[PDB]
Amino acid sequence: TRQMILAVGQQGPIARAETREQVVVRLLDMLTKAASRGANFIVFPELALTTFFPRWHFTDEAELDSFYETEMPGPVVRPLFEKAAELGIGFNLGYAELVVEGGVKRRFNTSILVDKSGKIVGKYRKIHLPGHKEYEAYRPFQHLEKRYFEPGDLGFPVYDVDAAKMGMFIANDRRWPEAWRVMGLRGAEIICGGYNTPTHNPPVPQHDHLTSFHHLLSMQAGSYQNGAWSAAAGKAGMEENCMLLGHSCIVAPTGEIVALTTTLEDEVITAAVDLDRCRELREHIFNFKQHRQPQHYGLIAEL
Amino acid sequence: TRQMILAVGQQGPIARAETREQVVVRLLDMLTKAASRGANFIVFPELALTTFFPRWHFTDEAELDSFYETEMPGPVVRPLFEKAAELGIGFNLGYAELVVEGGVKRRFNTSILVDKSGKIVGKYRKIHLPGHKEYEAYRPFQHLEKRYFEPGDLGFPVYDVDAAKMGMFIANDRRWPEAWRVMGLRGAEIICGGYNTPTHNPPVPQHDHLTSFHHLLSMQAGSYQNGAWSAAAGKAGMEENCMLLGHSCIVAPTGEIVALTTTLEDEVITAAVDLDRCRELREHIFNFKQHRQPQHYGLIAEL
Amino acid sequence: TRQMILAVGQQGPIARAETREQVVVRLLDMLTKAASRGANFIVFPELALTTFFPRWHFTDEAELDSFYETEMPGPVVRPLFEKAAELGIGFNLGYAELVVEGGVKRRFNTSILVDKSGKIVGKYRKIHLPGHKEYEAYRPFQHLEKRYFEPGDLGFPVYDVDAAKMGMFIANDRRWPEAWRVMGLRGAEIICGGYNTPTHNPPVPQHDHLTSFHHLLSMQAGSYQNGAWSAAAGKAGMEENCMLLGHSCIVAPTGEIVALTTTLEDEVITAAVDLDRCRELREHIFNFKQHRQPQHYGLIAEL
Amino acid sequence: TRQMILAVGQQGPIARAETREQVVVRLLDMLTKAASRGANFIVFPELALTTFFPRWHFTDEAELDSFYETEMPGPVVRPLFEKAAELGIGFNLGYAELVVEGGVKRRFNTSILVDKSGKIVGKYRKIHLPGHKEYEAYRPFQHLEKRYFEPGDLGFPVYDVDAAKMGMFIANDRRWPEAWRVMGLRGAEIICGGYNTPTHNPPVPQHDHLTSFHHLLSMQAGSYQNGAWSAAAGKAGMEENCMLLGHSCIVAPTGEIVALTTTLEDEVITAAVDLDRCRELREHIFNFKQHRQPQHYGLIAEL
């Protein structure tokens, strides 16, 4: 087939004390409603199981570890996979991944793709870690991802998810044309991921009123230039006193926004997706093999 | 500190019978108007000295050649350079370049940067030739760029132009993130060029109503993701029965559009440009050294 | 209730020879798919039963009359109402209305609202007739609505349609703030209608590339300023050699576009609608009774 | 024929302790810069002579009064008028007006138009006072306009300013279609004003990320639907712990944005304005005499 209905499950805030059981309840509800609307795949936010902990400066490692998943899924998250298989609707779930190798802990900002059978068919680990590295007393909230996470070691892969070639990005990655391009070259038909974007940036507050503009601009250009459908799921609202951006969206391979959220709570949007639409770009104006000149792009790949 | 007034000189149509002498009078008029408005640099369109000849299939090589420049500047175009030096305003001029080397008549879609002293500071030759190589019957008007030009051989250079790092793109180039990124990586503070974009696309007519959108989307995303000011000068209006896109523009490093033409005739727009404003992006969210992961972009440079 | 799922059924072209039976087939299909996606109301285009005949200069009245409905519904259109009642989904259908009063024929560009029970609960007749009045030989297609239709005599009413207060506009009306305002004052929660908008305007072709911009601008401002959800259903594509605008849409009371079509064929888009969202505007920034100053708006109502 | 260069002088913050003498130096600087760029008229912000005092509840009437002008111009503001006449550039200046009539201390949020001769050509008093009348505890900062001003008593006039029909609006007014329409009906070719728009809205915080969108949406739709050029000068930046919206702009009669500020500081933008361009709308799609149906708008003018 080449037809499907894609959905985005935007999340409202997640409190520090809110349990994964409670979140799964909210997650289940969205997946159920999306399915009731015909969707066979739903995109969830970056780190969708917990509050955005990278905003705090940690000192107690046990504290930090508590925000990561040591298995996927665990007993508490399993019900999501079961419901996924039951209703026949895949999903993109973001979470904090903790792996212990030879006694050494490895941390990643992760996202996985589950097909409509309820099976994990791909994973991606955040490659572009935003923010600063050291505590900055002036900021009303920190952004210490470079500390609590290592740069993804999977590159930007593209997986087959129920007849659709899908690629993954996580939050900040969406702002990097390289991320989109690599997956575009790998033939992605859909490029999705979630995000936690504060509408306020302490180091550059003069860009606060452009938060939506910059986010939407990234999704539209990315889709357009790679002739791919895209979807972004944000966790929005006032979370732990930090206002997070909404405007979760689904974009056509022409860069046109076909669905957009308007609340700052859990919200489901859907859009019919024709995987062959990609050809309007990828076989003409952006027919890579016929127009690209990689012999002159070398600087982009230099270390 | 490090400020200037950038101008864009959009051209209205140029008829097949319109002479270069006549076109130069028009270019002189806009350059002068720009200077009277405080502009230190003005961006002119792609192939700004003649009608867009790539729309017709030529059988007479003598006739095809007439549309190319063998000198830059020649006696006819020279007056433009003199005015530039006189009024202290540089410019970016696009034209068809014909040069014989090693027994080969090389044809380039070229653009040059002249500083406010009237001196040619640097050149660029279109690398992404859009369209087709052979006459196509299903088209109401041709776009034989692949036939009339060979891909530029200068890469995507960035030159110093009156203490401003400027990079050049030509029409279709603006749609490629690779072009923008290479120059962004070279430190371009201003990225500019001209264009001839028919509002009708024979191959994919269902995108006709998106001509403007796709054009501005490319300029905005390019500027933003590279923290560079940008400007695009189009040649618009009904030229030889083919409508060309207007919306010539100047964009800030934030991707915000600061100036936009509203007519389809010769028109000058201007904007105050602060070269330090690039830092808001290039020293933060898009601080390449601190964020880019080139080890993962290799596929982009693969042949 | 205050929750519902609104849908728009965009139509591809309708040939002059295409029969109403064939159109109903297309109409039925969209209403069925919209219902399968949870929608309880679907908006259809202006004059959705026929080709846009106002583009031709008629001479044979029998010819002209053939494009109008003498009853609503007739045997051929009835199946739409039946399916509507069956699936529990109302709709907004536009059509050419022919009424014979005392031997005198009355013509209107009409639209009706059918609730989920399949009953007509309101009607509106186009008040702002666009175009010219006399044949203009230069135009590749005419726009003679002022001739084939009389100005609506129902004003801009607002009806109760299954727990939702809905108002109607037809094509061009959407460009007039007065139309939106009157219905906004009447408490409309949803303001919908369809349209036939050629992407080319013979008298002002310099606005062709702005066709989408102007259309979307009208829907967004209208919704925002009246704190109402809105939806526009277009009949798009190359119809009888005239390219018609797509970008059918659904807008939130904040002016945000929550759903947008991307093809130029029959296409269904949906969006969840919370009738209470209207309060965010109508009870605050646009709390009419608390902020408006009608004693100074007199000029708007003067004849 | 009938052309001019319109400028907008956006203000950065104005501290409570900042004196009028100091503010005037800033206004003189932008007016001069505008003239050097060929501008014949510059639009300044709402209450451009002091900080936005409506944000604080005052108990001392003497202190509240200090923020109002009793003369226009007074010795301190006079220098601005002299420069205007000298450089031949008119302006639109907003300030708090205090006038005693019939034993009443009348307080208006005012704006005046001065021609390029330094002569006050006309006045306007804000008719739509946003905010509230009594101190509200739930607000982080007040907006007591309803308390500190009474609705203007001059209606929405249109004056001749150096052969240009200009109408005035003040901040919140721009959001009301009635204000735009009244002046549109009066034949305004340019509709302009200033504003103080906090990017945070206590009553409806879920619209904070839409502050820019709503602002530009209002300017664009107003211009387009009335076929009028427009311009809005905002006072932006972090003023007294409250962030104010930037994005000061100039819009063509088509609703297209031709110039837009990018900083949150004092900034001058300009645009070439062709007063005849209004005809493209006012003599066609929006030819009022030929299209408006006032007999159906009565509710708009009802008290």
Swiss-Prot record, chains A, B, C, D:
CN hydrolase domain ranges (all copies): 4-275
EC annotation from Swiss-Prot or TrEMBL: 3.5.1.77
SUPFAM superfamilies assigned: Carbon-nitrogen hydrolase (SSF56317)
Catalytic activity: an N-carbamoyl-D-amino acid + H2O + 2 H(+) = a D-alpha-amino acid + NH4(+) + CO2
Record Gene3D superfamilies: Carbon-nitrogen hydrolase
Keyword Kinase tagged: no
Broad enzyme group: hydrolase
Annotated GO MF terms: N-carbamoyl-D-amino acid hydrolase activity
Pfam family, one: CN_hydrolase
Role played: The enzyme catalyzes the hydrolysis of N-carbamoyl-D-amino acids to the corresponding which are useful intermediates in the preparation of beta-lactam antibiotics. Industrial production of beta-lactam antibiotics is now being developed using this enzyme.
UniProt-recorded name of the protein: N-carbamoyl-D-amino acid hydrolase
Organism listed in the record: Agrobacterium sp. (strain KNK712)
